Amino acid sequence: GRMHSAGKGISSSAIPYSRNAPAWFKLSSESVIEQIVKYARKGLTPSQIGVLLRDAHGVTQARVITGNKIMRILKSNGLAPEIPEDLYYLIKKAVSVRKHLERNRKDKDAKFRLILIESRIHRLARYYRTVAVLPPNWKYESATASALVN
Amino acid sequence: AVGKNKRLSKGKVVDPFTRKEWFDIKAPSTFENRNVGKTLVNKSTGLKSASDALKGRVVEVCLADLQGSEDHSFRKIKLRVDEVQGKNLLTNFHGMDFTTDKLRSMVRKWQTLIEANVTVKTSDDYVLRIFAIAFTRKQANQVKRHSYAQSSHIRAIRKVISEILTKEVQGSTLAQLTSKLIPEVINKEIENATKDIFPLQNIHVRKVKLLKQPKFDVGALMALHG
Amino acid sequence: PKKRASNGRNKKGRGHVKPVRCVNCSKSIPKDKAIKRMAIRNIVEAAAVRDLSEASVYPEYALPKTYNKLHYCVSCAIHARIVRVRSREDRKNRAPP
Amino acid sequence: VLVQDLLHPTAASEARKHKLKTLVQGPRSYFLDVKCPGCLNITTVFSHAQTAVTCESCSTILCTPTGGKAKLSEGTSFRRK
Amino acid sequence: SQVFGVARIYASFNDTFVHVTDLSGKETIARVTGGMKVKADRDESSPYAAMLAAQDVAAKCKEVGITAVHVKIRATGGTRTKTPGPGGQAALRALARSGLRIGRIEDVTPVPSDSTRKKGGRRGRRL
RNA sequence: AUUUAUUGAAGACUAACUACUGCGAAAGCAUUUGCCAAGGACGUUUUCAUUAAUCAAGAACGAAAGUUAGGGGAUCGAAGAUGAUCAGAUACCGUCGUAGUCUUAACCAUAAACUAUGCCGACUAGGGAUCGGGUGGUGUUUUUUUAAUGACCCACUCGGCACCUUACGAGAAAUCAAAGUCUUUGGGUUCUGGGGGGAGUAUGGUCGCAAGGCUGAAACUUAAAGGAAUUGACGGAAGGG
Numbered sequence: 024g025r026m027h028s029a030g031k032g033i034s035s036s037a038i039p040y041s042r043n044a045p046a047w048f049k050l051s052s053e054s055v056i057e058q059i060v061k062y063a064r065k066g067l068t069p070s071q072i073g074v075l076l077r078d079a080h081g082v083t084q085a086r087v088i089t090g091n092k093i094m095r096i097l098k099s100n101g102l103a104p105e106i107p108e109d110l111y112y113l114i115k116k117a118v119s120v121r122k123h124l125e126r127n128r129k130d131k132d133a134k135f136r137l138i139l140i141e142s143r144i145h146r147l148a149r150y151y152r153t154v155a156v157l158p159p160n161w162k163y164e165s166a167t168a169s170a171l172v173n
Numbered sequence: 174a175v176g177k178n179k180r181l182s183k184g185k186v187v188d189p190f191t192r193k194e195w196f197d198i199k200a201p202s203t204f205e206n207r208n209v210g211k212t213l214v215n216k217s218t219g220l221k222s223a224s225d226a227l228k229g230r231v232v233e234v235c236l237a238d239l240q241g242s243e244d245h246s247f248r249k250i251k252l253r254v255d256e257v258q259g260k261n262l263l264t265n266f267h268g269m270d271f272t273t274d275k276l277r278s279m280v281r282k283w284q285t286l287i288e289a290n291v292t293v294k295t296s297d298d299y300v301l302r303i304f305a306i307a308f309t310r311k312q313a314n315q316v317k318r319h320s321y322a323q324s325s326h327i328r329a330i331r332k333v334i335s336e337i338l339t340k341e342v343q344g345s346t347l348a349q350l351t352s353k354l355i356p357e358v359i360n361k362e363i364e365n366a367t368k369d370i371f372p373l374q375n376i377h378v379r380k381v382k383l384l385k386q387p388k389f390d391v392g393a394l395m396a397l398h399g
Numbered sequence: 400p401k402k403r404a405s406n407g408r409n410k411k412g413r414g415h416v417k418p419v420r421c422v423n424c425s426k427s428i429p430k431d432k433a434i435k436r437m438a439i440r441n442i443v444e445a446a447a448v449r450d451l452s453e454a455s456v457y458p459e460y461a462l463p464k465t466y467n468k469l470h471y472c473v474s475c476a477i478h479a480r481i482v483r484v485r486s487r488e489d490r491k492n493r494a495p496p
Numbered sequence: 497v498l499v500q501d502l503l504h505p506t507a508a509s510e511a512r513k514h515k516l517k518t519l520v521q522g523p524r525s526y527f528l529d530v531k532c533p534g535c536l537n538i539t540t541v542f543s544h545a546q547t548a549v550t551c552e553s554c555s556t557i558l559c560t561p562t563g564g565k566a567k568l569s570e571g572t573s574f575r576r577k
Numbered sequence: 578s579q580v581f582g583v584a585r586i587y588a589s590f591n592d593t594f595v596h597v598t599d600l601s602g603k604e605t606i607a608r609v610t611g612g613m614k615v616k617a618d619r620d621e622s623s624p625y626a627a628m629l630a631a632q633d634v635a636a637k638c639k640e641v642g643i644t645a646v647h648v649k650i651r652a653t654g655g656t657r658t659k660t661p662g663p664g665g666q667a668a669l670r671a672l673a674r675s676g677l678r679i680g681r682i683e684d685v686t687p688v689p690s691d692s693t694r695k696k697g698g699r700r701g702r703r704l
Numbered sequence: 705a706u707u708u709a710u711u712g713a714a715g716a717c718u719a720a721c722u723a724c725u726g727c728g729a730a731a732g733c734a735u736u737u738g739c740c741a742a743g744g745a746c747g748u749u750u751u752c753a754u755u756a757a758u759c760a761a762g763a764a765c766g767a768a769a770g771u772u773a774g775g776g777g778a779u780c781g782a783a784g785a786u787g788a789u790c791a792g793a794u795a796c797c798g799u800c801g802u803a804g805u806c807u808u809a810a811c812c813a814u815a816a817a818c819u820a821u822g823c824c825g826a827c828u829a830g831g832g833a834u835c836g837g838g839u840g841g842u843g844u845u846u847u848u849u850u851a852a853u854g855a856c857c858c859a860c861u862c863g864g865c866a867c868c869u870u871a872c873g874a875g876a877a878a879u880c881a882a883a884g885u886c887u888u889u890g891g892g893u894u895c896u897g898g899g900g901g902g903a904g905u906a907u908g909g910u911c912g913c914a915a916g917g918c919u920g921a922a923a924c925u926u927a928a929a930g931g932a933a934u935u936g937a938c939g940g941a942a943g944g945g
């Protein structure tokens with residue numbers, strides 16, 4: 024794998040066999056759900072919410088404590104982003120590389136890496152457009168992208 | 174070959190050692206000896222004022238002969254003549270440096286060479302470039318055969334060496350710096366500070382060069398030669 | 400045919416290694432392909448050792464050394480009997496003698 | 497070896513493997529309950545934390561993140577939950 | 578009781594220099610080279626020419642007044658050979674046996690930190 | 705003159721450390737430090753949920769030499785000027801030396817650009833080293849004798865650059881842990897070849913200021929050209945008797 028590199032690493036989470044977890048956990052579904060939407064109200068993405076629930080609170084993973092997933096909880100409570108999280112992070116990585124390239128033109132490596140970053144952006148944008156979470160005619164172009172980051 | 178010269182000049186002698194005189198060279202007081210040897214200039218004729226030709230001479234001389242012991246045998250000391258008074262011409266510190274064989278023996282392979290240098294000014298306004306070298310070492314019980322450092326360790330060690338050199342050279346004058354360089358206390362200060370980062374044997378302070386000298390100010394020079 | 404598995408050099412994972420000059424003929428050779436030796440010698444060569452030891456102003460003197468790392472091209476190392484041609488079975492020996 | 501029980505490996509040999517290369521993959525991490533000096537305030541902290549987890553009563557920071565397992569602060573008393 | 582100069586033997590290939598100076602190195606006594614003692618371009622760097630030059634430098638430095646010498650043996654250096662030529666050990670042993678006293682032998686061959694370019698081309702000196 | 709000493713200027717390079725070691729898509733990358741973005745592996749009871757593999761068209765980078773226009777021009781040095789060697793020697797050797805070598809803004813787009821081994825995936829033998837991360841060990845050592853640390857040691861694991869031994873197997877062999885799982889012939893996909901010359905030539909396009917790059921035949925000619933090993937013979941190769 025590692026589609027834009029030669030790396031072949033196997034490092035991922037190995038989630039447990041019990042889909043109903045963890046039998047030292049006494050809290051209720053509504054308490055962790057209000058915790059989730061409180062974290063979302065102060066502007067945190069589902070990844071950071073899950074990290075905070077995993078470490079500070081004991082929440083093994085939110086799909087097995089509650090019924091649904093963190094993004095579904097946010098979307099149902101009305102705090103869903105206009106563009107998905109991985110697309111947003113790839114666009115802000117691209118805007119950092121373009122600002123550096125404007126400053127330092129002689130960075131051919133940055134030019135190469137920018138081509139890779141924008142290839143990943145177009146692959147996600149094609150997928151998200153094909154499931155209609157982005158409207159068709161959503162296009163990534165650089166002068167729009169510097170502002171879609173805010 | 175003696176006979177191949179076509180012309181010695183394009184165009185077309187009295188003994189020169191009678192005309193010269195001796196002069197005894199004196200070390201500053203931060204050295205166990207003073208008498209390092211003798212030097213020659215012309216007689217101070219009416220046009221020449223031979224002391225003035227004799228001012229700018231540097232004599233490099235081993236620390237063993239200045240200090241008596243033979244443990245300093247691999248360090249040389251440059252002594253600059255700084256005033257002439259009556260046949261016993263008076264010198265001053267101009268620079269330490271190692272010898273080629275000592276440095277070539279220290280640097281071996283399957284270990285990391287670590288260098289640092291700073292360009293720091295002292296209390297009496299000389300500008301010094303101090304060089305330091307160090308080399309990684311194996312532990313006892315170590316079975317792998319190379320013992321390299323991990324190149325952030327080197328960066329941290331070089332930071333600690335630079336901060337120690339800068340701290341010691343401000344707040345020392347030069348005569349204090351020579352009396353610090355003789356017993357090797359800087360080497361022990363470096364080894365005390367760096368043992369908690371990596372083992373790092375052979376922690377010698379390499380050459381020191383004067384880069385800019387302040388104005389003459391004869392009283393401090395005469396303070397050395399008692 | 401391919402004579403050596405290592406291509407006669409030591410380069411697995413670079414693409415380029417910056418070259419050195421032969422000490423004998425000034426031929427440019429990659430640093431991994433060279434024939435590096437290390438010439439460690441006393442300066443007085445063991446025949447003048449008694450004359451200088453009795454001529455010294457010092458007792459107990461060190462008799463110091465010269466250190467040099469010699470870099471040889473393949474042609475000069477073979478011509479100077481530093482390395483020589485070995486048998487097919489004996490080329491695979493990497494140990495020094 | 498040409499005959500072996502692939503369905504019932506020994507406990508030692510399964511403990512030697514990587515977490516994904518075992519028979520059924522599962523985490524080797526765990527949770528701890530950590531008690532901070534002073535106020536009792538038991539709190540559950542993940543073993544490989546990635547965050548500077550603090551107890552709600554006071555800034556009495558319980559673990560620091562590292563490349564692997566979190567380093568628990570020195571006066572702390574943990575139990576493996 | 579002993580008065581010192583320094584000896585400064587530059588023993589390259591193609592010639593050999595014996596050049597005594599004072600301890601400061603500005604005042605020169607008895608610079609005699611190898612080629613000043615033979616009748617051929619070949620033997621300028623011979624050990625025999627080296628010992629004759631060292632003998633005659635020993636004579637002139639004793640009659641000047643120098644009794645002992647600090648010896649600095651040197652090769653060409655730069656981007657050239659760095660091993661000493663054939664006349665080095667000959668000159669050293671000759672000024673040792675002549676009656677001068679010896680001290681503090683050192684090598685002063687100028688070694689570069691990645692010098693400019695060696696001559697010869699990338700194919701070398703093809704002969 | 706050469707040689708010695710004290711300083712100064714210039715431009716280039718980054719020795720020793722330097723290795724069957726590291727990073728980079730390749731070309732390539734070795735003084736210190738600061739800034740600017742980037743990346744792999746590891747860890748992970750985080751998050752999305754098929755978003756993937758390979759790739760005509762099209763695109764970014766691409767050693768050296770070369771070109772255009774400025775700067776800079778220390779060293780080496782195509783051409784050239786010369787001194788030898790030689791039958792001849794505008795070659796090898798020696799002394800100089802222009803362009804170049806360095807840099808900025810543009811081109812060029814080739815190399816024995818090589819591991820002469822396309823990329824992705826699964827399975828099939830052992831072994832010991834090492835590089836990066838993690839885990840475990842009341843393990844040594846340093847420091848506040850006790851602590852974390854750091855550096856080592858032992859065991860395991862993930863990812864890497866490789867190496868050694870077998871020959872399950874493969875192969876024409878040399879050899880190969882992939883060049884195996886291929887007449888018991890089907891995991892996915894892209895590119896190239898079809899006897900040797902003529903020939904990477906003509907011609908037509910197309911890119912380039914040029915030098916040239918990329919596409920690219922035929923008439924005709926030929927019975928071999930070639931690969932890997934074997935035994936001799938020879939060597940201005942190394943040893944022995």
Ligand SMILES: [Mg+2]
Nearest residue numbers: 025026027028
């Ligand atoms: Mg891909």
Ligand SMILES: [Mg+2]
Nearest residue numbers: 024031032033
């Ligand atoms: Mg994989």
Ligand SMILES: [Mg+2]
Nearest residue numbers: 400401402403
């Ligand atoms: Mg052959």
Ligand SMILES: [Mg+2]
Nearest residue numbers: 413414415817
């Ligand atoms: Mg290459």
Ligand SMILES: [Mg+2]
Nearest residue numbers: 690718719735
């Ligand atoms: Mg260096």
Ligand SMILES: [Mg+2]
Nearest residue numbers: 321324725726
């Ligand atoms: Mg390294």
Ligand SMILES: [Mg+2]
Nearest residue numbers: 783784794795
């Ligand atoms: Mg010519």
Ligand SMILES: [Mg+2]
Nearest residue numbers: 816817818820
């Ligand atoms: Mg090819």
Ligand SMILES: [Mg+2]
Nearest residue numbers: 824825826882
């Ligand atoms: Mg494969």
Ligand SMILES: [Mg+2]
Nearest residue numbers: 836837838861
């Ligand atoms: Mg490891």
Ligand SMILES: [Mg+2]
Nearest residue numbers: 834835863864
């Ligand atoms: Mg490994």
Ligand SMILES: [Mg+2]
Nearest residue numbers: 412835864865
């Ligand atoms: Mg690797």
Ligand SMILES: [Mg+2]
Nearest residue numbers: 400931932933
């Ligand atoms: Mg053949």
